[PDB]
Scaffold this active site. Structure first.
Site, PDB file in Angstrom:
ATOM      1  N   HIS A  12     -15.980  -4.890  12.353  1.00 34.75           N
ATOM      2  CA  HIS A  12     -16.573  -3.604  12.751  1.00 34.75           C
ATOM      3  C   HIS A  12     -18.039  -3.710  13.143  1.00 34.75           C
ATOM      4  CE1 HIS A  12     -13.247  -2.918   9.922  1.00 34.75           C
ATOM      5  NE2 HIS A  12     -12.854  -2.067  10.851  1.00 34.75           N
TER       6      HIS A  12
HETATM    7  C1  LIG Z   1       1.196   0.299   0.700  1.00 35.24           C
HETATM    8  C2  LIG Z   1       0.922   1.179   1.906  1.00 35.24           C
HETATM    9  C3  LIG Z   1      -0.311   1.297   2.443  1.00 35.24           C
HETATM   10  C4  LIG Z   1      -1.502   0.483   1.931  1.00 35.24           C
HETATM   11  C5  LIG Z   1      -0.439   2.163   3.601  1.00 35.24           C
HETATM   12  C6  LIG Z   1      -1.615   2.336   4.183  1.00 35.24           C
HETATM   13  C7  LIG Z   1      -1.718   3.171   5.342  1.00 35.24           C
HETATM   14  C8  LIG Z   1      -2.892   3.335   5.900  1.00 35.24           C
HETATM   15  C9  LIG Z   1      -3.069   4.170   7.134  1.00 35.24           C
HETATM   16  O1  LIG Z   1      -1.788   4.733   7.584  1.00 35.24           O
HETATM   17  C10 LIG Z   1      -1.684   6.142   7.216  1.00 35.24           C
HETATM   18  C11 LIG Z   1      -3.640   3.256   8.232  1.00 35.24           C
HETATM   19  C12 LIG Z   1      -2.530   2.264   8.740  1.00 35.24           C
HETATM   20  C13 LIG Z   1      -4.179   4.119   9.378  1.00 35.24           C
HETATM   21  O2  LIG Z   1      -5.311   4.907   8.892  1.00 35.24           O
HETATM   22  C14 LIG Z   1      -5.042   6.345   9.061  1.00 35.24           C
HETATM   23  C15 LIG Z   1      -4.614   3.261  10.594  1.00 35.24           C
HETATM   24  C16 LIG Z   1      -5.057   4.219  11.742  1.00 35.24           C
HETATM   25  C17 LIG Z   1      -5.714   2.246  10.222  1.00 35.24           C
HETATM   26  C18 LIG Z   1      -6.442   1.845  11.479  1.00 35.24           C
HETATM   27  C19 LIG Z   1      -7.069   0.467  11.430  1.00 35.24           C
HETATM   28  O3  LIG Z   1      -6.300  -0.621  11.770  1.00 35.24           O
HETATM   29  C20 LIG Z   1      -6.806  -1.913  11.698  1.00 35.24           C
HETATM   30  C21 LIG Z   1      -5.991  -2.928  12.092  1.00 35.24           C
HETATM   31  O4  LIG Z   1      -4.589  -2.663  12.365  1.00 35.24           O
HETATM   32  C22 LIG Z   1      -6.436  -4.221  12.088  1.00 35.24           C
HETATM   33  O5  LIG Z   1      -5.507  -5.303  12.447  1.00 35.24           O
HETATM   34  C23 LIG Z   1      -6.159  -6.600  12.639  1.00 35.24           C
HETATM   35  C24 LIG Z   1      -7.764  -4.475  11.834  1.00 35.24           C
HETATM   36  C25 LIG Z   1      -8.634  -3.441  11.468  1.00 35.24           C
HETATM   37  O6  LIG Z   1     -10.052  -3.788  11.226  1.00 35.24           O
HETATM   38  C26 LIG Z   1     -10.588  -4.674  12.260  1.00 35.24           C
HETATM   39  C27 LIG Z   1      -8.174  -2.101  11.529  1.00 35.24           C
HETATM   40  C28 LIG Z   1      -8.942  -1.013  11.105  1.00 35.24           C
HETATM   41  O7  LIG Z   1     -10.163  -1.153  10.877  1.00 35.24           O
HETATM   42  C29 LIG Z   1      -8.418   0.291  11.155  1.00 35.24           C
HETATM   43  C30 LIG Z   1      -9.294   1.498  10.798  1.00 35.24           C
HETATM   44  S1  FES Z   2     -17.756  -5.021   9.606  1.00 40.72           S
HETATM   45 FE1  FES Z   2     -15.920  -4.073   8.745  1.00 40.72          FE
HETATM   46  S2  FES Z   2     -15.085  -5.570   7.435  1.00 40.72           S
HETATM   47 FE2  FES Z   2     -16.943  -6.483   8.233  1.00 40.72          FE
END
Ligand SMILES: C/C=C(C)/C=C/C=C/[C@H](OC)[C@@H](C)[C@@H](OC)[C@@H](C)CCc1oc2c(O)c(OC)cc(OC)c2c(=O)c1C
Ligand code: FES
Ligand code: HEM
Ligand code: HEM
Ligand code: HEM
Ligand code: HEM
Ligand code: HEM
Ligand SMILES: C/C=C(C)/C=C/C=C/[C@H](OC)[C@@H](C)[C@@H](OC)[C@@H](C)CCc1oc2c(O)c(OC)cc(OC)c2c(=O)c1C
Ligand SMILES: CCCCCCCCO[C@@H]1[C@@H](O)[C@H](O)[C@@H](CO)O[C@H]1O
Ligand code: FES
Ligand SMILES: [Sr+2]
Ligand SMILES: [Sr+2]
Ligand SMILES: [Sr+2]
Lengths: 256, 428, 179, 179, 428, 256
Positions: free
Chosen positions: C144
């Site tokens: 990020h």
């Molecule tokens: C056991 C179940 C669990 C823990 C469920 C968790 C669910 C969480 C959320 O779903 C509701 C979540 C998926 C959702 O947030 C609303 C997405 C938009 C998140 C967006 C998302 O993606 C990343 C990503 O894919 C990556 O790949 C390499 C890398 C990332 O950083 C570089 C990101 C990341 O920085 C973000 C904000």
């Molecule tokens: S800048 Fe987001 S994990 Fe390092």
């Protein structure tokens, strides 16, 4: 094969209130280490569990020292190295010696009666008793029928039921005559083959009972937790049952 | 279709919700269904089954979080669950013994139905959906048992996939397909894991239809006499609303059942199991005391009763030009024993619903019950004399009951008269 | 009166308790298991490390950076003024929890040649890219956009803190013991 | 007329085809995969085998029995009349599909000392226990009670056939090549 | 709701079945619902979504038959599926690209609703259930993406479990719980497998309620004018039965969509993916070009727009005594962007249902649409100037649209008049 | 790091009708075997696939002979043995040489424009072109800016974008000035380092193009099957679409 007779040893851990005897387990661990370990392993048992509550409960430093005798292969290094409490006991050094991790559970000592399972219902599955019986069941003289036909490399054992038996020992129908059969394990014990620190008696009888308790723990390390969880659940439910009964009773009263 | 009272929006949240999604109304009409006042303890097993399904599903999802479906890691992973996972030992035993509770309960549930004619019109669909659930339960429990990859796991998988190998012509193919290869191996374990996870949801879906089905006709009661539908007035004389009258009896029963269940799990978790499954799968050696899971024993007994030496098998082998040998005959007999039970609605010709008022029926019924227990008990015995005979007689009686005795009693029996109303019976 | 009302309430009460008793373990099975909780300590041979070189090693499943800093790295680090730092805490487990983020407080040695820290971005976990990357001659987190200076202090981006320094100390001439 | 009726017909027809085209692969993924389908051949050193000893080896995921029979085993085998067998076919892939279940037709050698067969019960797959077990001096299947004689022929129980004999041949003095 | 004729048992099998389980009746009343005649091509996405759910579930079950959820075998196992399993390569690509089709479709489905006020009374429940489905879809797709155990898999798991680590106070605990340890490891992969399998069924269950919900109110149409309920007569002037009129254009649309979909899968299966996930997870190294899955980009963009230097963050950091730093602010902004969309029924104060008759609304709506595309596009850009600014403005506009612009337009806009009937509109 | 320029090679397999050239793949396999294999492995590639259709398609005996060169450690034996077609190519012999099994997919050669992805939409992801470019991108003379500061053990490469670059080669803002960067892989090729049987030309250019096609196949062995499946699906659906359209048209005609 079939099922047989096992000496019914009263182990501290049997019964809903039964619990392991920490010192016995410790003695048993010595027997396993000094005798059994030469051929049998305990591949599913993490050494560090020697420290956890409900078992031998040895001080972490002792355990750490203990793990040192084992010469393990590092999962990265690949090169060899001394053992760490995070390692599991090793595999059986003797190819045909079975792993002892789960033995106290992979054998039943109480069978029937009449294949009704009523015997176990009141006596338990009987794995530790079975193990005891096998360690305890090597007689000096073979039963008569075999006298001249003992398979070479085997030993007669009263409790062992899955071994081979000389032709001269089966009846008209091929069923074996002897109480036991021939096992590939030479008699392991021998009075005072192990020197117990606290001077406890090391009679083949005692050692067999100790190592058996130890193996029960190695197989069910969570025995005590399980039973504590049991009482708990039973208490909740006994209470809840009575209350639901009264509630049920009051609720229907307004009908019949 | 009993006359009663329907839901009425009171709160504001309620009225708002009701004009958009009548879900609270539906829940109410379901929880408020008029139920015969005379139901006895044998009507508690359906709730015990619903609970079991939920218990199996949640403990299952949890176990699947620590389990590895691979031959080199499966058994080790169940030991890791037992030794390392917080409460793992208890979760494992709850899932295992939960399977038993699940079957103890369906057998009581099934026999309750066979006795009170709960399968008779207009309840045939309820009965058929239930039969589908039963088949799924067996397939599910079988695959689950294979996951640990112990000795019973491997050989039981070898044998059960072998059943399909017995089908003439297509058999070898179906068996190769189920195995994913020439023998039970990793490809087999891997697909069983996926299917063990999937089936319970299918069961849940079927259970939904099952509930809908008996709700459509209304529950049957021990007298076989329907609830009066002519007026709210008398209908109430015959019933009481499910909530809270039966909901509480059920929960109370469930608590008693769970009391015993937890006592088992806490104090003798390995009693209903097989010690040999604590031995790692050995593809080169079958244990001398291999024996099926107890809830499979009766059908197993029927299957091995039919050896090459059985007369009816020899007749069958002759008449079919050999297509039907003992192997296939045993397989047909086993699945057939289940199929005739599914057909009971069309084999029982008596118009009297409850067997409480059938004097001759009561005799054959209890023989059937005893037969089931005998079959279960012989399944665990050897094939030597006299067990071989006992299994044949028991199997014979089983098919006799459904194919001969029930259709005959229909025309030959003199049924006692039942009460004219549930009310009548209840006050008595 | 409240004889029957109390019962119905004591009943539902027992229920709730039993229910929770069942729920907690379904939740707790997901917490670290006993094999994981066996958090060791490790030793790193650091004799082949020339200045300008970073050693990345695994510990507790996360990367740990061991950089033998150059003069330029040390110069730039010492040149920064505390009040110019986004995070002024040293985040060094080897010293007082209150210590300040001065370059001297971020290294193992007084010459400030040995920088040892968790190569775990304090924002959301990624491992920052070394080799003097970023806008502050340190590390750059590609996840990020966090930038860390040559002492591993956060200077820009969403990361709230300086890369933590674990218990670490030279156990001898060329060996550091982490944890 | 049948202008619009044919269309609706041709349409549903295309559907069905597409549907099947989707279904077949969902079924076929379960058939043996390429790594599985790589059915090799193996070699077994048989120099440490004394008579009265059975060697159990894995091949294609199933056990293969290699027994060096004793004189008693051979006598008893040769003493059975074809018409006394449950299955008269030799089930030997090394010879004619029509061959008869004579003991000579069940071994690799003329002396009939080498019995090599799939240790896979023909009933439902279990591996029969050897060491001269059962009512016929052969093997006993504990799964449902099948007995095999000293030539591996079925004599009792639900198994419909004799234990199959795979392609096998001594490749030399002390080596047998299975498959 | 809308006047319709009901099901009537004809065949014998039908009347037999109907008196026991009215399932055929229910299917009929569902397949026969009167649907506004004026629906346009933007009403096809719900069917595309239902298909996707089924596609994902069957290909998933199948993939799970060959997949191993263990860090030492997971990646190798997906390669085994690609190289060895019959049709494996195609099944894998269908599941992967199916996730993208699934999201392409929800975004069109969602925006269709935002434009025609399909979330406005009496459709709030339909909308809320849909929002729950959306949350589940994201959590499902996230866990699925972790299964292959490639580079994007490992680090994406590290980051997403990290989000929870940002919650003040309880955060570190929740994160340790989700991970099963101090870092993303086998315990994490193992539980994600189980949950990836489970969630799709929850979604299916929710979709059932979703369908029930819009069936209870009747579909909305492009004019926002309800179907006349006063008489079967006029109701019919406004509608046509779902079967076969809409069932067929939906299937027709679906065929066109699948045509493009299969063309993608057959010819450019890796276009919508990230090359770095063909590299095995390396816990000691984060790829320089790590980028989220495209359908996650817009929310990702919103999250990283908020660095320590943003004024609103500094204000919040000051005002909250440092409890809300950029780290947590970004997390709140991201989940908040989803939450305000869920609240739109209560933020849109205009009583005019369809935005077709809202001149000012039209403008802000299309800005919102463009904003979504911009956010998606910036998410894949670096954090340097001017992207940092663009993301802030785009994020700003997003919250402005829901929290400011919609509540104001309600009282300020002069809405054009809508047709008096669907029929009127249809003929035009 | 970032993204860069790659020589756009026209590979036979590109395009919806593209297919591998069996002889090129064979030549490529020789290059991989004689050159690359010394450091790079292909651990996910089963040797036996050299026989399967849609690839080099070598006769099973040749493949069986080929597998003989590798020395594999048997999975139960633990003891070493010759290689079998059922074995996978080995792991990289050089610890820092990445595995080449999936390289042609683990790399993109076409980026943007403006991060819009429109470039790939029309050019593909570009993995083989990228690989080609790297093999092809080692110039004899380093760019001036670095002349005296070349990291030791590294080599300048025009296509490689993730390598280190001398300080003397970064602009005012720290961004690299060079088109490429420094890679730990010494130039592997050199004209006619490999003798093709059929006398095909072994210019660094040719070999690089062949081994690149080979690596594309090693990564997507089912490329052709996938594309065949694609055309099929498209034809069914194109037909079915037209029919559903007509059906739809006729059905609504009776209303609008
Ligand atoms: C056991 C179940 C669990 C823990 C469920 C968790 C669910 C969480 C959320 O779903 C509701 C979540 C998926 C959702 O947030 C609303 C997405 C938009 C998140 C967006 C998302 O993606 C990343 C990503 O894919 C990556 O790949 C390499 C890398 C990332 O950083 C570089 C990101 C990341 O920085 C973000 C904000
Ligand atoms: S800048 Fe987001 S994990 Fe390092
Ligand atoms: C140490 C006192 C010791 C114990 C305890 C022990 C136990 C034991 C059991 C319970 C079995 C399994 C018997 C069964 O199958 O029911 C078993 C089997 C074998 N053992 Fe053992 N054994 C102990 C010690 C030793 C030692 C020191 C050796 C090696 C000299 C040894 C060997 C074996 C072998 C071989 C077997 C296989 C028995 C068979 O199947 O024939 N044991 N042991
Ligand atoms: C229909 C309800 C279910 C029944 C009857 C059932 C039955 C079984 C049985 C008999 C076993 C073997 C137990 C043993 O001896 O070790 C088992 C194991 C297992 N089941 Fe289930 N199961 C059910 C639902 C589920 C579900 C829904 C899941 C997956 C979410 C699941 C996951 C597992 C796992 C992972 C194992 C292996 C661990 C073990 O051996 O205990 N089960 N199941
Ligand atoms: C987990 C699987 C099952 C569940 C959850 C279940 C549940 C229920 C429930 C809740 C009832 C109503 C209460 C009662 O009468 O006990 C019921 C009734 C019934 N069930 Fe099941 N059951 C299951 C399996 C079966 C099976 C296997 C059969 C027989 C093949 C069956 C046959 C019936 C019948 C005939 C009734 C009577 C309905 C009536 O009285 O109208 N059920 N079941
Ligand atoms: C599994 C994904 C989903 C499926 C399968 C699904 C399916 C459907 C279907 C079949 C319809 C009716 C036909 C149409 O208008 O396209 C529909 C309508 C609708 N959906 Fe969904 N939907 C999904 C997700 C969502 C989401 C995420 C939202 C918004 C958060 C949503 C909001 C709506 C609304 C508001 C309607 C219109 C209701 C009406 O017209 O009365 N849906 N959905
Ligand atoms: C809600 C629909 C679903 C969505 C959105 C979804 C999404 C995903 C995604 C994004 C991946 C990674 C694909 C890749 O790039 O390789 C994946 C993998 C996987 N999914 Fe799902 N999935 C769904 C349902 C299911 C179901 C029901 C199962 C059945 C267990 C399943 C099993 C798997 C398996 C085994 C993998 C790993 C192998 C692979 O990467 O293809 N999925 N899923
Ligand atoms: C993907 C594959 C699938 C879904 C296969 C599904 C099969 C489903 C059937 O259920 C519908 C089947 C389980 C059911 O037959 C009606 C059972 C009563 C079979 C009973 C059964 O158990 C055995 C067993 O457990 C064993 O353990 C070690 C061993 C066995 O021989 C020694 C048997 C056995 O000989 C029999 C007949
Ligand atoms: C109807 C939509 C059809 C889309 C057709 C897209 C054709 C893609 O064709 C691609 C090439 O563009 C790519 O360079 C090579 C790389 O090996 O692979 C081919 O399949
Ligand atoms: S499998 Fe051998 S007797 Fe049945
Ligand atoms: Sr006792
Ligand atoms: Sr500022
Ligand atoms: Sr090109």
């Amino acid at each position: 094969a079939g099922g047989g007779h096992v000496e019914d040893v009263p182990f501290s851990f049997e019964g809903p209130f039964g619990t392991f005897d920490q010192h016995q387990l410790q003695r048993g661990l010595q027997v396993y280490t000094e005798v059994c370990a030469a051929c049998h392993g305990m591949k599913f048992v993490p050494i560090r569990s020697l420290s956890e509550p409900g078992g031998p409960e040895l001080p972490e430093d002792q355990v750490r020292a203990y793990a040192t005798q084992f010469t393990v292969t590092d999962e990265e290094t690949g090169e060899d190295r001394e053992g760490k409490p995070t390692d599991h006991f090793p595999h059986s050094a003797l190819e045909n010696a079975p792993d002892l991790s789960l033995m106290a559970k992979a054998r039943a000592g109480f069978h029937g009666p009449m294949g009704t399972g009523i015997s176990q219902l009141f006596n338990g599955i009987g794995g530790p008793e079975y193990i005891y019986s096998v360690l305890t069941g090597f007689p000096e003289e073979p039963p008569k029928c075999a006298e001249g036909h003992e398979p070479d490399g085997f030993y007669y054992n009263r409790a062992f039921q899955n071994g081979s038996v000389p032709d001269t020992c089966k009846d008209a129908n091929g069923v074996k005559t002897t109480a036991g059969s021939w096992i590939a394990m030479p008699p392991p014990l021998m009075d005072d083959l192990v020197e117990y620190a606290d001077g406890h008696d090391a009679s083949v009888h005692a050692m067999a009972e100790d190592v058996s308790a130890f193996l029960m723990w190695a197989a069910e390390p969570k025995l005590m937790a399980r039973k504590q969880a049991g009482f708990t659940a039973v208490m909740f439910l006994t209470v809840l049952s009575v209350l639901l009964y009264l509630t049920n009773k009051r609720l229907w009263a307004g009908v019949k | 279709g009993i006359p009663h009272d329907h839901y009425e929006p009171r709160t504001g949240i309620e009225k708002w919700l009701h004009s958009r999604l009548p879900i609270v109304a539906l829940a109410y009409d379901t929880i408020m269904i008029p139920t015969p006042r005379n139901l006895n303890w044998m009507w508690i097993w359906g709730v015990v089954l619903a609970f079991c399904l939920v218990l199996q599903i949640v403990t299952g999802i949890v176990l699947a979080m620590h389990y590895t479906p691979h031959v080199d890691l499966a058994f080790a992973s169940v030991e890791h669950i037992m030794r390392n996972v917080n409460g793992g030992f208890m979760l494992r035993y709850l899932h295992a013994n939960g399977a038993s509770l699940f079957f103890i309960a369906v057998y009581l549930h099934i026999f309750r139905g066979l006795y009170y004619g709960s399968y008779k019109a207009p309840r045939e669909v309820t009965w058929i959906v239930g039969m589908l659930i039963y088949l799924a339960m067996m397939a599910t429990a079988f695959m689950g048992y294979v996951l640990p990859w112990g000795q019973m796991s491997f050989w039981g998988a070898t044998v059960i996939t072998g059943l399909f190998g017995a089908i003439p012509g297509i058999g070898h193919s179906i068996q190769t397909w189920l195995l994913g290869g020439p023998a039970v191996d990793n490809a087999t374990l891997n697909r069983f894991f996926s299917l063990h996870y999937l089936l319970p949801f299918v069961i849940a879906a079927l259970v939904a239809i099952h509930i809908w089905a008996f709700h459509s006709t209304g529950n049957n009661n021990p007298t076989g006499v329907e609830v009066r539908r002519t007026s709210k007035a008398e209908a109430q004389k015959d019933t009481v609303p499910f909530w809270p009258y039966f909901i509480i009896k059920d929960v109370f029963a469930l608590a008693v059942v769970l009391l015993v269940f937890f006592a088992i799990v806490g104090f003798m978790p390995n009693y209903l199991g097989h010690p040999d499954n604590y031995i790692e799968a050995n593809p080169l050696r079958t244990p001398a005391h291999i024996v099926p899971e107890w809830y499979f024993l009766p059908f197993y007994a029927i299957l091995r009763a039919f050896t090459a030496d059985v007369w009816v098998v020899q007749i069958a082998n002759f008449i079919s030009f050999g297509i039907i040998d003992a192997k296939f005959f045993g397989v047909l007999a086993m699945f057939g024993a289940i199929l005739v039970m599914a057909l009971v609605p069309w084999l029982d010709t008596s118009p009297v619903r409850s067997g409480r008022y059938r004097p001759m029926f009561k005799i054959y019924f209890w023989l059937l019950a005893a037969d089931f227990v005998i079959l279960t008990w012989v399944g665990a015995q050897q094939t030597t004399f006299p067990y071989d005979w006992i299994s044949l007689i028991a199997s014979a009686y089983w098919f006799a009951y459904f194919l001969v005795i029930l259709p005959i009693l229909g025309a030959i029996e003199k049924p006692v008269a039942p009460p004219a109303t549930i009310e009548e019976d209840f006050n008595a | 009166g409240t004889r029957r009302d109390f019962l119905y309430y004591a009943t539902a009460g027992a229920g709730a308790v039993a229910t929770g008793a069942a729920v907690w373990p379904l939740i707790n099975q997901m917490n670290p298991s006993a094999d994981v909780q066996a958090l060791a300590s490790i030793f790193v041979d650091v004799s082949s490390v020339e200045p300008g070189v970073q050693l990345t090693v695994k510990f507790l499943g996360k990367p740990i950076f061991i950089r033998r800093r150059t003069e330029a790295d040390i110069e730039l680090g010492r040149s920064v003024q505390l009040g110019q730092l986004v995070d002024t805490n040293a985040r060094n487990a080897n010293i007082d929890a209150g210590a300040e983020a001065t370059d001297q407080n971020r290294t193992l040695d007084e010459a400030g040649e040995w920088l040892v820290m968790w190569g775990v971005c304090t924002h959301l976990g990624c491992s920052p890219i070394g080799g003097v990357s970023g806008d502050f001659g340190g590390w750059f987190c590609p996840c990020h956009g966090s930038h860390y200076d040559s002492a591993g202090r956060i200077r820009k981006g969403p990361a709230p803190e300086n890369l933590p320094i674990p218990l670490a100390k030279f156990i001898d001439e060329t060996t550091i013991q982490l944890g």
